[PDB]
Every structure is written in C-alpha cells, then in structure tokens.
Design an enzyme around this catalytic site. Sequence first.
Site, PDB file in Angstrom:
ATOM      1  N   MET C  41       0.836  -1.193   0.000  1.00  0.00           N
ATOM      2  CA  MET C  41       0.000   0.000   0.000  1.00  0.00           C
ATOM      3  C   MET C  41       0.874   1.247   0.000  1.00  0.00           C
ATOM      4  O   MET C  41       1.836   1.336   0.770  1.00  0.00           O
ATOM      5  CB  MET C  41      -0.931   0.016   1.213  1.00  0.00           C
ATOM      6  CG  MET C  41      -2.048  -1.009   1.166  1.00  0.00           C
ATOM      7  SD  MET C  41      -3.152  -0.850   2.582  1.00  0.00           S
ATOM      8  CE  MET C  41      -4.436  -2.017   2.146  1.00  0.00           C
ATOM      9  N   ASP C  42       0.536   2.203  -0.861  1.00  0.00           N
ATOM     10  CA  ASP C  42       1.235   3.477  -0.921  1.00  0.00           C
ATOM     11  C   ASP C  42       0.561   4.467   0.028  1.00  0.00           C
ATOM     12  O   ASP C  42      -0.233   4.086   0.893  1.00  0.00           O
ATOM     13  CB  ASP C  42       1.284   3.992  -2.358  1.00  0.00           C
ATOM     14  CG  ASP C  42      -0.090   4.110  -2.984  1.00  0.00           C
ATOM     15  OD1 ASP C  42      -0.850   5.022  -2.596  1.00  0.00           O
ATOM     16  OD2 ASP C  42      -0.409   3.291  -3.870  1.00  0.00           O
ATOM     17  N   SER C  43       0.889   5.753  -0.114  1.00  0.00           N
ATOM     18  CA  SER C  43       0.339   6.772   0.776  1.00  0.00           C
ATOM     19  C   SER C  43      -1.184   6.793   0.721  1.00  0.00           C
ATOM     20  O   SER C  43      -1.859   6.697   1.753  1.00  0.00           O
ATOM     21  CB  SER C  43       0.902   8.146   0.408  1.00  0.00           C
ATOM     22  OG  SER C  43       2.304   8.214   0.592  1.00  0.00           O
TER      23      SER C  43
END
Lengths: 49, 105, 95, 75, 108, 161, 80, 78, 183, 506, 60
Positions: C41-43
Amino acid sequence: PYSNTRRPWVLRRHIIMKNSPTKWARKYSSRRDEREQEIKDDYIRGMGE
Amino acid sequence: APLQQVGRHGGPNKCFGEFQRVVECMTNAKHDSYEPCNNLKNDYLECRKHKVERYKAFLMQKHAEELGKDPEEIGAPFVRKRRFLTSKTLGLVDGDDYEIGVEKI
Amino acid sequence: QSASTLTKEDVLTRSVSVLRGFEVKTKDIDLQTTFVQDLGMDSLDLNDALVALEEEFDVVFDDKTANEIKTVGEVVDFVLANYLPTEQSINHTIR
Amino acid sequence: MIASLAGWGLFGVTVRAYQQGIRKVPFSYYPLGYVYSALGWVAFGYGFNLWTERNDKLLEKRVEKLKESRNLRLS
Amino acid sequence: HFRRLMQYKKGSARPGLAKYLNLFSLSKSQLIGFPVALGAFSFLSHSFANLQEGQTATGEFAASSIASLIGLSIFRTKKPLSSNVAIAVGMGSLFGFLTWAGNFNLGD
Amino acid sequence: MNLEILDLSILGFYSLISSNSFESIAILVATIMPVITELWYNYSQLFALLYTLIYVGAVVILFVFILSVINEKEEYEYEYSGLFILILVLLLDDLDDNESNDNDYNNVYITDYADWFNNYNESDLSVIGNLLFTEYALLLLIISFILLMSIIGLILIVKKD
Amino acid sequence: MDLILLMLVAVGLNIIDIYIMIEILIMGCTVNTIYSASLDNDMIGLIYSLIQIIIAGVESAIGLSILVNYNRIRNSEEIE
Amino acid sequence: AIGDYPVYYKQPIRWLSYHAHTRPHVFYAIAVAALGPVFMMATPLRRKFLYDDHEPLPANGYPLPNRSRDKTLTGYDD
Amino acid sequence: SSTHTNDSLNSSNYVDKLKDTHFVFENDKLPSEIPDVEEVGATTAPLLSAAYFIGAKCQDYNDDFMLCQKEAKGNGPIDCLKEGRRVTRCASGVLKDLNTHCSDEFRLHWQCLSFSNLEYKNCRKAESLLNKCVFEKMNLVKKIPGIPEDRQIHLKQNPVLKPVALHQDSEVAFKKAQNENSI
Amino acid sequence: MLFTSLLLIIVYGSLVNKSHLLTKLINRLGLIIIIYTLLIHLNINTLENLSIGINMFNNLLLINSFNNTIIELILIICILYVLLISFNITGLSIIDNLNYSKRTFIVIVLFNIIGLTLLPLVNDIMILFIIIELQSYSLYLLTAIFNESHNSTKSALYYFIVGSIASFIILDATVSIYDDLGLTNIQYILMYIDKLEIFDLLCLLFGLFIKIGLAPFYSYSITIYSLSPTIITNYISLMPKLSILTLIYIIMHYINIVNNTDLNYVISFLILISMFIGSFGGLNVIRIKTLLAYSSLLNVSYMLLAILSNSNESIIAYIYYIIQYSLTHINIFSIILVISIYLPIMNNMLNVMITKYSPIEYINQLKNLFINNIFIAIALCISIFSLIGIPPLTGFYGKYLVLISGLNNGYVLLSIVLIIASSISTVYYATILKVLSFDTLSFKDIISNNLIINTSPENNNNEIKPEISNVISYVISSLTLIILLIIIQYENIVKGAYLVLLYNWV
Amino acid sequence: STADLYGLISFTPKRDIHHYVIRVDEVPGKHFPTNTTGNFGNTVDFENLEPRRKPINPYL
Ligand SMILES: CCCCCCCCCCCCCCCCCC(=O)OC[C@H](COP(=O)(O)OCCN)OC(=O)CCCCCCCCCCCCCCCCC
Ligand SMILES: CCCCCCCCCCCCCCCCCC(=O)OC[C@H](COP(=O)(O)OCCN)OC(=O)CCCCCCCCCCCCCCCCC
Ligand SMILES: CCCCCCCCCCCCCCCCCC(=O)OC[C@H](COP(=O)(O)OCCN)OC(=O)CCCCCCCCCCCCCCCCC
Ligand SMILES: CCCCCCCCCCCC(=O)OC[C@H](COP(=O)(O)OCC[N+](C)(C)C)OC(=O)CCCCCCCCCCC
Ligand SMILES: CCCCCCCCCCCC(=O)OC[C@H](COP(=O)(O)OCC[N+](C)(C)C)OC(=O)CCCCCCCCCCC
C-alpha cells in the site's frame, strides 16, 4: 323518562382506560356477582314464609 | 358528622333518608348488635342501584315470555323521540299528530 | 449498557475481511502483516484502508496514530482500546 | 428514685465514654463532657420514670375491666 | 406469548425493551409443558384427595412430584433424567411441607 | 346507532400502530375528545367543560416538551406488525364490552320522580363550591398546599442554579 | 382480551408515552366517579371528581419537570 | 448612601419608597390586594353607621310553621 | 341549572340517544277509592302571575298540606292525599275568581311575563294594576314575608333594574288608570 | 407549627444570599422547628386521652393511641436525620458540602413530614388520595434534589412512574368503593363492611404494597436505593414505611371485621415471595446499599406478618419492631456516612469509579474498619447482629414478638419460612462482619498514609484533634448502646406497648 | 401474676359483622347548606334523639 344507567362507552371500550384492578374484577371475577345474586335469590325465597 | 349524598341543589338527595336511618340505627345505644340495622342497610343500597327491583322486572319479563304474552299487550306505551310527543298521544281534544317544537324553548 | 463488547479475535477477523476487499498483494493477513511491505500500500492506498477500517468499527484514528501505524496488529489494538458504543436516546435505555 | 437516676447518670457517662473511643481521643479529653452527658440522660431518666410510673397506673385500671370481661367469658 | 410478539414488532431497535421481553419469553416446550404440568397437578391433587377422603401432605407430595416430573420431561429435555428427578423430589417436598404446615393459615 | 363505538375503534387502531412521540400525544387528544363529548351529553355537562379547560392547557405544555426531546429515533426505526393481525386483535377486543356482569343492572331501565320541594334551584357548581369552601375547606387548603409544593418542586428540579 | 395484558402494546415506546398512559388511566377513574355521582345525584362524588382532576394535573407537572431535567443533563455541556 | 438599599426595620418609610420607585409592579399590586381585607375589617363600621344587613333569604325549602297541625281546619272537602 | 337527570326532559335528543330514554305513558287512572279532583289548568305564566294570590288565599291549606308531609315520616305521598286535594281546589278557586273579576288585568300581567322572560321586575306596571284590582274585588294583598312593609321590592318607586323593552299594552293600560282613577 | 414555620423558611431561604453557611444554619432552623413540633404535639396529645379515638376536621381525620405513637416516632426519627444535614458528618468540606449545596433540602423534608404524619390519620377516601399524593410528591422532589446528578434524576424518574401507577391503583380502589356505596367517610363505609366488595380494599393494599417495595414490586425499590445518594437513600428507604405500614395496619384492622380468608391467603402469598426474594436476593451482591435494600424488603415482610395477624400481640409486635428497626436503620447509615474518611486514595484494575454522592458504595470498602476505628466497627457489628436477630439485642425481641403474633393466629407456614429466611439472610449479614474484622491480625502491622482523613490539616500538632465531629459520633454512641442494652429496660417498654390501643378497650 | 397479666392483655376479643366499633358520635343531616327540607325523607328527629352509643375509655 326511563333510561339505562350504564357506564360511558369510552370507559368500557378504550384500549387503555378500561384496564384497572377493580375493572378486571368486575369484568372477569364472579366473586362480586355471586354474592350479590344471593340478595336477589333471597327476595323470591321469602315470599311463601 | 360529615354530609353524604347531597343533591344537586344543596339539600338531601333521594337516598339520604335511607343513609340517615342507617346511621341512627348503628349509633343507637339500645342495640346490642348490628343485626337489627341489617334491613336498613339493604334499603339504602336498593335506593341507589335498584338491583332487587331490576331482578324482579327480569322475572316478570321472562315469565311472560313462556306464557306467550305479547310485550305490547301487558306493557306500558312509550315514545322514543321527544319531537313526537304529539298532542294526539297526549290525548288533547283537538290533538294533532304533527311534531312538537323542541328546538328552542 | 454503554460498554465495549469487542474481542481481539472478532476485531482481527473483521479487519482481515475489510482489507481483502482491496487490491492487496496477499490474502494472508495476520497481526504482523505490514501495510507498506506485505500489503503493498502506498500513501493514498493506506489511507483508504484506514478510513475503511474506521467505517467498520465506528472509530476515528487520530492524526498521530494514523501517520505512524505500521502493522494490522496496531490497528487491532487501537480499536480495542478506543471503541465505545454511541450514546442512545433517553428512550432506548430506560423504557 | 435516686438509685434509678444514678443509673441513668451512669448510662450517660457510658455514652460519653463510648463517644471518646469513636472520636479517638483520650477518655480524659474535655472532662466537662461527662457532666453534660450524665445530666442529659438524667433528664431523660426522670422523664422515663414518670412514663413508667404513669403506665403502671393506666395498666391497673385497664386490668380491672379485662378481668370483668374474662369473668363473663368464663360463665 | 402472541402479545409479546407484537411488542417485539412494535420496536426491535431499542435494547431496553428487548432485554425485558427476553426474560418473560417462554420457549415452545415451556408453552406446552407448563399447562400440562399444572393440569396434571390439578388432576392428581384432586384424585389423591378423593382416595384418602381428604388432602394430606403425602398426596400433595405425590401430586406435585409426579406433575413436576411430567412437566420437566417436556421443557427440560436437554438434561439428564436423574437431574429432573432431583428437582421433582425437591418441588414435591416443598408442597408437601406446604400442606403439612396447614396451607397459608390454620384457620379455625 | 352509537357512533361512539366507531370513534373508539379508530382511536384503538392508531394506538397499536403509533410509532413516534408526536403520534402518542395525538392519541391523548383523541382520548380526551370522546370523553368530553360523551360527558357533554348524558351525564355531566359541567365536567365536560372542566376537562376541556384544564387538560387542553396540559396538552400544549406536553407538546412543547416533545419538541425539545425528539432525537430521530422513531423516524427510521422499523415496525413489522401486519394488517391482518392488528384487525384480529381489535376484533377480539370488540367481542367483550360488558364492563359489568349484573345483567339486570344493565338491561332494566329506571326512572326518577321529580319533586317541587327545591324552590331554590342552582347549578351543581354552586353546590360544589358551597360544600368545598365550608364542609371540606381542609381539602381545599391542602390542595393549595400541594400546589405550593409543586411550584417549589418545579423550580428546584429544573433551574440550573 | 384484557387478561393477556393487551394494553401493554397500545402504549408507545417512549418515556413520554408512559406519562400519557398514566394520565389516561387516572382519567378513567375520574370518569367513573362522575358516572356514579351523576346517577346518585351526589355532589360529594363531584367534589371527589374535581379533586382528582386537580391532583392529577399536579402529578403531570412534577413528572414532566423530572423528565425535562433528565433530558437537560445529557445535553448539558453547552461549551458553545 | 445616596442610592443605597434601605433597611426595612430601620427606615420603614424609605424602604417602601425604594420599591414604589424601582418595582412598581410589586408595590401597587400589593396595595390593591391589601384594600380587600381592609374593607372587610371596616364592615362593622358600616353596620353601625350606614345600614344593617339584609334579612337572610328563604333558601332552605318551604317555610314550615313551627306549630302542630290545625285539626279544626275544613273546607274544599270531597 | 340545566343538569341532565332521569326525572324530566333532558337538553337534547342526543342525550336521549345515549341514555336510550323511553318516554313512558300510563293509561290507568287513580283507583276509585281515592276521590277524584279537578287538576289546575293554568300554564307557567298564569301561575307565576297568581303565585302571591294563591298564597294569600290558601295559606292555611298550604301549611296544612306541608305540615302533613313533615309529620308523615316518609309516607307523605300516600297519607296526605286528602290534604293535597284541598290545596288543588283552593288554588283552582283563586284562578276561577281571577277569570271572573280581574280577567283583563290578570291576562295583561302574565302575557307581559311571557313577553319579558317571566321576570317580575319587567312587569311592574301590569302587576300594579292587577294588585289593585284583586284587592278591590277579592281583599287579597301581595305580601313578601320577612321584611318591613315599606321595603318590598314590588312597591319600590325607583328600582335600579328596569325592563329594557317596554310592554306597549302595559304602558297604555297604566296611562288609562293614571289620568282616570287618580284625577 | 410545621405548616406555619415552613412558610417562613420558604420565604427566608429565597431572600438571603446563596451560600453553604446560610444553608447549614437554615437546616438548624428546621431542626428547631421539628423539635418545637414534637414539644407541642407531646403537650396536647396523650396516650390515655386518645384511646377512644377523636375525629377532627369534619371527621376527615381520626387520631387514636395507635396513630399517635407513630407520629411521635416519625418526628423523633426526622430529628435524627436532620442532624446529618444540620452538622458535620465527616468534617471535610469536599465530602460534607454536598448536604449544604441545596437550600430546598430542609424545605422538602418539612413538606414530607406533614404528609407522613397525616397519612395514618386519614378517615376519608378523598383525603386518603390527597395525602398519599402529598407524601408521594415530596419523595419524588427529594429524590431529585440533586438535579446535577445523572443517577439522582434517573431514580426520581423511575420513582415518579412507579408511584404514579400505585397512586392510580389507590385511586381506582377508592373510586370503586364509592361506586358500590356512595359514601366517602371510612367510618360510614364501616357500616357497610359486610356489603361491599372486600377485594376492593385488597386493590387499595396493592397500591400501598408497591410504595413499600413489597414483592413482586421489589425491583424498583432496590434500583432506586442503590442509585440514590446515601444521604437521600437513608430517608426514602425508611420514612415511607413508617406511615404506609401504619395505615396498612388500620386498613387490615377494618378488613378483619369480616375475616375474609381469601384476602389473608393473597397477602400471605406476597409475604412468602418477599421472604424468598429478600433472603436469596442479597446473597450475590457487591453494593452495600443494594444489600440494605434487600434487608429492608425482608424486614418489611416480618412486620407484615404481624400486620396480617392483626391481634392484640400484633400491636405490641408492630410498635416495638418499627421503633427498633428505625433506630437500627439510622445507626447503620450514620456509620456508613462517617467511615468514608478511611477510604484509601489512588496514587488501574477494574476501573472502579466512586462519586461524591456515594463515597461508600461497595461492601469491600469497609475493609480494615476494625483497625481504622475499633469503636465504630463494634458499633456497626452490634447493629448488624441486631438485624440478624442475636439476643439480647433489639432485633431479637422484634422477631420474638413477630413470631408470637404469627403463631398465635395460626401462620405456621409463614413463621417457619421467616426463620429459614432469617438464616439465609444471615449469610450476607455475616459478610459485612467478615470484611470489617477477619483480616485484623494480618493488617495490624500495616501503614496507611493514603487515607482520606490523612489529608485533613492539623491545627498546632499539640491539640488532640478528634477524627469525628461531636454530634454524629454521639448519636452513633447513643443508638448503639440502646440497641445493646435493651434488656435493662425491655420489660417497661413492652408495658408501654401494652397501653397502645386500637379500639380494643375491653 | 405475670402469666395471669399476659393472658388478659394478649386475649383478642372476637369481632364480627354484628359487633365492632364505629367512631361516629352524631347523626348527620340536621343542617344542609340549602334546601334542608327536601322530599321529607329525613325521618330522624333531632329534637327527640335517643342517647348515642358512647365509646369506652378503659383508662377512665
Ligand atoms: C406468567 C407471568 C409471569 C409469572 C409471574 C411472575 C411474577 C410473579 C412472581 C413473583 C416474583 C417476581 C420476579 C420478577 C418477575 C419474573 C419475570 C420473569 O419471568 O423472568 C424470568 C426470570 C429469568 O429467567 P431466565 O431463565 O434467566 O431467562 C430466560 C431466558 N430464556 O426467571 C426468574 O428468576 C423469575 C423467578 C423469580 C423468583 C421468584 C421466587 C418466588 C418464591 C418461589 C418459592 C416460594 C418460596 C417458599 C417455598 C415453600 C413454600 C411452601
Ligand atoms: C379535527 C378535524 C381536523 C383533524 C382531522 C385529522 C384526521 C386525522 C386523524 C385524527 C385522529 C383520529 C384518531 C387517531 C389518533 C391519532 C393518530 C395519528 O397519529 O394521526 C393519524 C394520522 C394518519 O396518518 P397515518 O400515516 O395513517 O399514521 C401514521 C402511521 N405511521 O397520522 C398523523 O400523524 C397525522 C396527524 C395530523 C394531526 C392530527 C392531530 C390530532 C387530531 C385530533 C383532533 C380530532 C380529535 C380525535 C377525533 C377522533 C377520535 C378517535
Ligand atoms: C443434615 C443437615 C441438612 C441441612 C440442609 C437442609 C436443606 C438441604 C437442601 C438440599 C437441596 C439443596 C442441595 C442440592 C441443590 C444443588 C443445586 C445444584 O446442584 O445446582 C442448582 C440447580 C441447577 O443445577 P446446575 O446449576 O446446572 O448445577 C449442575 C448440576 N449438575 O438449580 C435447581 O435446579 C434448583 C431448583 C430451582 C430452585 C428452586 C427454588 C425453590 C425454593 C427452594 C427451597 C427454598 C426454601 C426457602 C424458604 C425461605 C425463603 C422463602
Ligand atoms: C465502653 C462501654 C461498654 C458497655 C458498658 C455498659 C455499661 C452499662 C451502664 C450501666 C447502666 C445502669 O446502671 O443502668 C441502670 C439504670 C437504672 O435502672 P432503673 O431506673 O431502676 O430502671 C429499671 C431497671 N430494671 C427493669 C432492670 C429494674 O437503667 C438505665 O439507666 C437504663 C439505660 C438505658 C438502656 C437502653 C434501653 C432503654 C431505652 C429507652 C428509650 C427507647
Ligand atoms: C438538662 C438536659 C441537658 C443537659 C445539659 C447540657 C446540654 C448541652 C449543652 C452543654 C454544652 C455542650 O454541649 O458543649 C459541647 C460539648 C463538648 O464537645 P467537644 O467535642 O468536647 O467540643 C470541643 C471543645 N474543646 C475544644 C474545648 C474540647 O459536647 C458535649 O459535651 C456532648 C454531649 C451533649 C450533652 C448531653 C446530651 C444528652 C442527650 C441525651 C438524652 C436523650
């Protein structure tokens, strides 16, 4: 003028107003009526003497 | 002694006399027991509810039914509408069957 | 009446179900499953999951906790410690 | 009656003495309290004796009528 | 039972009402077992009284214990039989003690 | 044709289906109105007006309290009921309407014989006031004592300071 | 139908609905008193009926005030 | 004390002036209410100086003469 | 007072409908052992106009009938039948005399009462003519007991309360007696 | 005296400035009012003169020797209660200022005292309804006197609804009697005692049974007593029973004229259930006031057995039991309020929250009272052993006299049950005693510098500062010794009960 | 002596619907607020009233 002496319709048909300890006893308990029927029965039985 | 059974005009009502005679019997010193006052108590309760007299009326109606007697032959004539208490029913000499005025006295 | 009825196993079970509705890398999620590495998961993807987890348990992560949470177990611990039932009207309790 | 009131005064000293233990003070703390306590229950004891002496007279008068009622029952 | 069902339908999002309704609620076996146990109690109490020409604690102990066991076998099926016998003996002994003491009052 | 029966049947039907608090205070109004009208005829016109004078003022105060408490609970809460079962319940209650089991008292009519001895005729309210202020003046004074307690009681319960 | 406690369904699911039920129940007793007094031609019963109306009105005021303060306490932060 | 609140038991007249000026809705409502009982206490003065009370009304039923029946009464017979 | 009762006609037919009122007639007369009497045929207005003349003429019979009621100890209706018939005949005689000696003055008075809500204060002019005529032909005087003779309200010269609408027949008759009788 | 002085206090309280000191001094004014009321009542009312029974106010009220005794008891117990709010109970502002915060505290009490005294005197069904509502409304206001407390307002809401239903039942019973007879005066009704439905009076008693927390209506009483503050629970759990039980005895006295056996069985059925719930109910509880609520229910059941019998021994049993139970009730609650100063201060598991309204809320908060204050602990032990019924304490003679009336009238089942219930209730009674003292020898060598009393500053380090104020400690000392030393004057006190007559005469 | 004393006091005399105490000392109806003379159904003469039942005072 001859007329009935019954209680108001709201007293004996309202979904809430007709419910009380004494009203249930009058409506569903024969203790009062059985005792009062004795007085009515005493009237006829006291005629012949 | 507090007042009980007071009529709508401040005086004694129909059943006060029965109640008064009950109180006099119960508070009288000559009596040894309350047995002599028993008949007076029944009269006061009969004055209010008329339960025994209604029972007597029940027997007479039921007795006439088994004998085949028609209610209108042994009963009392009655009128259900006040506007139809006509002068013909009242027996006036020139009595008419037209309705009487009961709107505004 | 107004008390938490959550358990560590039930909270973890519902946390996994929410996270499996996303495009995570792995469907094997436990307490030690990290969002950044294991789930990929990114930001913005992480913040979408956090808000989705907020909707399930009716809780709100604070700014400091949300900006520092790393594993699913930390999410489970936060829910257990902070969850409260919403106050009802006067009629719900005393009637 | 002095012995009766002496006992009531002794009871008042006991109440004050028991109060000192409740409040955690030496039993010699404010010795005038025992004088106040003793005289308070002496006044109660004087009234109590009048209550009992009056009650004895009332009981005897009622007993006379009860015996008359019992004699009628036992006949 | 039917009236309490209406109360459930009157509202099912209020925890307070539901908590009290659950306490008064009876299972289907209880709704059947209770009238049978009471009916059996009334029959045996009257039947045993006629045999002895009067009501005794022995007859009431038998009437209460047997009727309770009949009822217990209906709404307490998921229990050992000996468990229901122990309660039936306990229930029968209480009503036997009730008759021995002279019901609620010795009267005359 | 006793139309009082129909009005009470309609009132009873809405009592079983009332959901929000506003419908409950409407039930109260739909209860006092049959009482007042049935009192206005038959038994007592005086207390039919007294019921209107006192209870209508209480209804408004009751209504204004509802506006400060409604909290969206019954605007989305579901009810199930069922039209068939509601009619069945009302039908069975309609079967028995005999409040008393003295058949003679209910079926035999009676009359009274008027007399001219009461030349001084006044309303029942004047006789009530005559007895209430003279024979039972203690009850009137205690009622005022109760009213005083309510005034003090309302202030201490409600006032923040 | 009364012995199965049918009236417990006619009462709504709010606290103020319980208050309304009590007012109706007390009003039934007053109507009965007026019924008996009018038949008997007894003004004593009408005195009783008037007292029951006044007393029941006092009861409503006290109960409402408790319910008003109870609702006030929950919404009592008033930080704004 | 150019505008102080007067003490009632020390300056009763000044104390009444304060309420008559600052609370007119209280001072004059009581003044009107006081005259009710005041006129009631002046009733004996009217009883002796102006006129006497009226005879009580016959609101007690038919006035029955306080005597035995007249057995010597006839007329309008059958 | 308009309180509903079971002894007379109620306010409206809706009261009758709720009470299921039956207006019952009896077709049987009094038994022959009770002597028959002629009932008074005057309506409300003539009776109120002649109320004080019946009292003056039949005071001893009114008292005797009422004394019979009190001394009967609850058996008044049955025992005092004889005394009741004396009052009925005496009252009828007063009305018969009013129709033979003062018919014009009598009819003027109770027709005014029917015109003025049956209130005595609204027919002083007609009553004064009637009172004068009865006294001069029957030696009966209206008297209000318990008060001094000069303090009777019907003899008051300037009453505070007076009728709103004058009765034209009373006004004309009053003027016909002012100029003629008092020259 | 009560009515006239109440009006003066109402006006005076609203005029002076709002402060804790003025409220406390006004509370002392209320104490003087009740003391003056007692002196006036004792001056004019005597046992011998009232033996016949004297009607008052157009026979609306009827006072006899039985009624007069309860009125004197009501005034005396109210005096001891006002001492709690008229003086310091702990000496600490953080605790004691709660009693001085509400100015209308003394006003509401004076309102209720008028209702309490007049209730046993009612002689009309109209004034019966008026007075019972006057007493009921005053109790609702006192329960809601702390309107900033969530529990106090919740309890008053519960109290209002339950009592209003009971008032409706009472009104419904009186109206049904009027319908049958048409009379409102009780003495007139007694003329038709053999012709009215005697079960309508049972409906009247059912309304009165609700107001005293009798089973099956016990649940609301336990909930209200536990949630309400200890200063409020001390009043509302005792005062209503003083007047309503006396009125129930009078009503049962009239009912026994016809001697309806069916009526007795129904009341016996309720007494039997109340003993079961009263005994087994308190076995598993952790709150002290919840425990006392079950204790209150059980003891009322014992008194109802005497009331149900309604004989000469019942008058002796009821009068003695109600007097000694009230003194024990005051003593226990007085000790509970004081001992809050020995509570440890946190400086957590179970997250226990204790509020200023009920500083003592759990039974285990009474731990180490034997070490903290040996004299107070023994005083509590004497009171608890009295509730158990250990002779020769006041509690034993109360149960001894109740058993005499019950067995004399043939209530064998209830007498045996009441003794089994007494043994069952001894379990939770002994639990209080276990908490007080059973760990004394292990905690004797312990250090407690964190107690509440330790926060009280010293004056000069040389003054002998008592831990408890003069008034409350003296009341506990007096009540404890009266309970303990009743054997000294037991014979004379019962002789006084011999002279309390309810139309016995001869 | 003590046993004899307790037997007297503890004895409860029998009460029934024929013998019990009623605390009414006078007959009502001597004066009504208005219309005292009604239908003449009041047959109780207060001018010839027989002595009322008096309450018993055991202490007098
Ligand atoms: C049909 C209408 C309802 C029946 C009437 C109930 C009211 C009258 C009873 C008086 C006591 C009132 C108690 C409160 C009312 C009971 C309400 C109720 O029924 O709740 C049921 C309650 C909980 O049961 P639970 O199994 O835990 O929950 C069911 C979930 N499926 O289960 C209970 O624990 C309730 C029982 C309470 C204990 C009462 C015991 C009374 C004493 C009985 C023994 C008598 C003692 C003397 C014995 C010797 C006599 C000679
Ligand atoms: C008086 C003439 C002018 C008024 C006529 C209005 C007729 C509507 C019914 C009058 C009341 C009859 C008895 C019913 C008791 C009250 C029940 C109620 O809440 O009102 C009924 C109304 C119907 O709408 P409905 O959607 O079916 O109900 C909600 C279902 N969740 O649901 C509503 O909530 C709408 C409420 C609108 C405002 C009504 C306020 C009460 C009116 C009472 C005045 C009449 C007195 C009662 C007369 C009949 C007595 C049975
Ligand atoms: C020699 C010295 C003798 C001294 C002692 C004399 C008395 C002895 C009493 C013996 C009976 C009690 C001992 C045995 C009971 C054991 C209880 C029990 O085992 O469990 C409780 C039982 C439910 O069983 P459960 O919880 O599932 O436990 C697992 C069992 N395998 O729960 C139950 O089913 C019990 C039945 C329901 C409760 C019935 C209550 C009705 C009243 C009972 C009598 C109380 C009388 C109290 C009288 C005063 C109060 C009114
Ligand atoms: C640290 C402390 C531990 C405990 C120590 C105990 C020591 C006891 C002190 C000695 C007392 C003494 O001597 O009492 C003697 C005196 C005088 O008796 P009398 O007037 O002849 O009465 C007759 C006595 N008969 C019947 C035995 C002959 O009675 C008293 O005053 C009684 C005190 C009150 C006791 C409480 C019951 C009465 C309450 C009345 C209101 C309800
Ligand atoms: C005629 C009957 C009444 C008796 C006469 C005395 C009345 C009291 C007035 C004296 C002053 C006073 O009470 O002063 C207060 C004292 C002392 O308190 P302290 O804690 O030492 O104060 C601290 C002061 N230092 C710092 C100087 C030490 O309190 C007492 O002694 C408490 C007992 C009260 C009196 C007994 C009452 C008994 C009633 C029981 C009957 C039912």
